[PDB]
């Protein structure tokens, strides 16, 4: 019921995958312990901290189903009694703490900047994730907490706001672990008990590199744009340094909440496996409720294939999504596979034309055309019986018709199940396309 944890990002224009994971882990812990998850924004430099960047953090987190209990909201709003939740609006507070330190002789002015008196003793950081970490701080020199230009350093800022916001657990990446002795020292120089720390090993690529900021696939928006599913991406985010003992990799966020524990986060670096993520998104693609998938698909479709919901044949669209969904892995694949279904022209290349629609192929399709137009109802079962019967009549295989049919109708060699595809398109569309292929 008690814990108070926070995610404290910098708005740069994108939400880094690792930043997303850190937000998730904090959100998971808060939800597991009936605690409170706070969002504060570190808006230091005016140049790179635009309102556009802020919207990305809001929308990316919401897209992942991650709310927050206190913090800023769009259009200049805020919720929470421990605000304001912007670093730029807390400068008076930073001074009060910094002046208090000077008054205690815990800090001193030197050449226009304030320097914290670093305790040069041994300090053990009892990290929940990394275990006890011995630091020898006898070498560590004093450091600036407020710079010559009057601005305040992260090392002081994060301690101040953890105090003011009554933060119980600080969950962040392991790139902060080396400075936690500085942060613990400040808490102690203020007579305030330091929070418990849980530092998460950094995510690495399979070849050992960090997911750098200008690399492809470093940002959450990129996967959204590529057609990834919210619940799937989030499920994979839980897999980055954590598991459920069953180690079945697919589980819903309710299970994740019920079982999440900081002491079960892996001590070794998580590896970002794009193939597993791709695979995971396919599992959700195929199995999620159709009416839940459809709104995503429309949104993917609006970036090209369909008009802004002036598409009048919704029923056909749902049919084409339903058949493509059981075989594709991402929104991008769906768009590729659904393209010929929606198109009026068909995109044929010469290699498929000489292999499938040659003279022998056309004659094969010419065998089917008269029966495809007589068949009623134009349904998956009856259409398959017609092709089976055709194959027997002509001493052919059903594949001899099936593949050429798909090529003639879509220009593609692979795609949704042939007989359902025939149904969804309908007799008129099927016959008109077969007619055009055979008699142009």
* Phi, psi for residue 415 in degrees, rounded to 5: 170, -165
Same domain, yes or no, for 354 and 399? yes
Same domain, yes or no, for 104 and 175? yes
The domain containing residue 326 runs over which residues? 289-342
Pairing mode, if any, of strands 131-136 and 122-127?
antiparallel
* Contact (CB, 8 A) for 95 and 151: no
Dihedral (Cα; 42, 46, 52, 58), 10-degree rounding: 10
Q: What is the DSSP string of 361-398?
A: HHHHHHHHHHHHTT-SS--HHHHHHHHHHHHHHTT--H
Cβ atoms < 10 Å from Cβ of 225: 13
Compute the distance between CA of residue 383 and CA of residue 386 in angstroms, rounded to an integer. 5
Question: CATH code at 143?
Answer: 3.40.50.620
Helix 154-164 and helix 180-189, axial crossing angle in degrees, nearest 10: 50
Compute the distance between CA of residue 117 and CA of residue 182 in angstroms, rounded to an integer. 10
Cβ atoms < 10 Å from Cβ of 389: 12
What separation in angstroms does the CA of 57 have from each of 6, 8, 41? 14, 11, 10
Question: CATH code at 417?
Answer: 1.10.10.350
* Contact (CB, 8 A) for 22 and 7: yes
Same domain, yes or no, for 254 and 355? no
Q: Which are the contacts of 139, defined by CB distance < 8 A and separation ≥ 6?
A: 120
Strand, helix or coil for residue 95 = helix
How were these coordinates obtained?
X-ray
Which residue numbers are catalytic?
213
Q: Which are the contacts of 32, defined by CB distance < 8 A and separation ≥ 6?
A: 257, 258, 259, 260, 261
CA nearest to 281, candidates 349, 326, 315, 233: 233
* Contact (CB, 8 A) for 33 and 1: yes
151-162 exposure pattern, b = at least 16 Cβ within 10 A, e = fewer? ebbbbbbbbbbb
Same domain, yes or no, for 94 and 196? yes
Compute the distance between CA of residue 186 and CA of residue 197 in angstroms, rounded to an integer. 15
- The structure tokens 């959700």 sit at 284
Compute the distance between CA of residue 194 and CA of residue 339 in angstroms, rounded to an integer. 57
**Token reading at 92:** 């008076």
Resolution value (Å, 1 decimal): 2.5
* Contact (CB, 8 A) for 181 and 125: yes
Based on the structure, what is the number of domains in the chain? 4
Same domain, yes or no, for 82 and 98? no
* Contact (CB, 8 A) for 196 and 126: yes
Binding site annotation covers 121?
no
CA nearest to 24, candidates 228, 242, 238, 263: 238
Q: Judging by beta carbons within 10 Å of its beta carbon (0-12, 13-18, 19+), is residue 412 exposed, middle or buried? A: middle
* Contact (CB, 8 A) for 246 and 240: no
């Amino acid at each position: 019921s008690h814990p108070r944890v926070r995610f404290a990002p910098s708005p740069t224009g994108y939400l880094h995958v690792g930043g997303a994971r850190t937000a998730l882990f904090n959100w998971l812990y808060a939800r597991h312990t009936n605690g409170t998850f706070i969002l504060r924004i570190e808006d230091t430099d005016a140049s790179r901290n635009t309102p556009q960047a802020l919207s990305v953090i809001f929308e990316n987190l919401r897209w992942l189903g991650l709310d927050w209990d206190e913090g800023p909201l769009p259009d200049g709003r805020t919720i929470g009694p421990f605000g304001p939740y912007f670093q730029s609006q807390r400068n008076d507070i930073y001074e009060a703490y910094c002046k208090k330190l000077i008054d205690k002789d815990m800090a001193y002015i030197k050449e226009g900047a304030v320097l914290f008196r670093m305790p040069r003793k041994r300090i053990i950081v009892p990290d929940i994730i990394c275990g006890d970490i011995y630091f020898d701080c006898t070498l560590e020199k004093d450091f600036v907490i407020r710079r010559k230009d009057g601005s305040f350093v992260f090392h002081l800022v994060n301690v101040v706001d953890d105090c003011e916001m009554k933060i119980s657990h600080v969950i962040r990446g392991e790139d902060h672990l080396s400075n936690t002795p500085k942060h613990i020292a400040i808490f102690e120089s203020l007579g305030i008990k330091p929070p418990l720390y849980a530092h998460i090993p950094l995510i690495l690529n399979p070849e050992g590199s960090k997911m750098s900021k200008r690399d492809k696939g470093s940002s959450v928006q990129e996967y959204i744009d590529e057609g990834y599913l919210p619940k799937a991406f989030r499920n994979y985010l839980c897999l980055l340094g954590w598991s459920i003992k069953e180690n079945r990799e697919i589980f819903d966020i309710e299970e994740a909440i019920a079982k999440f524990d900081l002491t079960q986060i892996h001590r070794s670096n998580a590896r970002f496996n794009r193939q597993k993520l791709l695979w995971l998104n396919g599992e959700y693609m195929r199995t999620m409720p159709l009416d839940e998938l459809f709104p995503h698909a429309l949104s993917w479709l609006k970036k090209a294939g369909l008009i802004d919901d002036h598409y009048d044949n919704i029923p056909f669209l749902k049919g084409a999504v339903a058949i493509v969904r059981e075989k594709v892995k991402t929104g991008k694949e769906l768009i590729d596979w659904i393209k010929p279904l929606l198109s009026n022209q068909i995109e044929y290349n010469d290699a498929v034309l000489q292999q499938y629609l040659d003279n022998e192929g056309k004659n094969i399709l010419k065998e089917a055309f008269p029966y495809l137009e007589k068949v009623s109802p134009f349904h998956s079962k009856e259409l398959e019986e017609t092709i089976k019967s055709l194959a027997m009549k002509h001493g052919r295989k059903t594949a001899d018709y099936i593949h050429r049919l798909r090529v003639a109708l879509t220009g593609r060699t692979v795609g949704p199940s042939l007989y359902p595809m025939l149904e969804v398109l309908g007799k008129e569309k099927v016959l008109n396309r077969l007619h055009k292929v055979l008699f142009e």
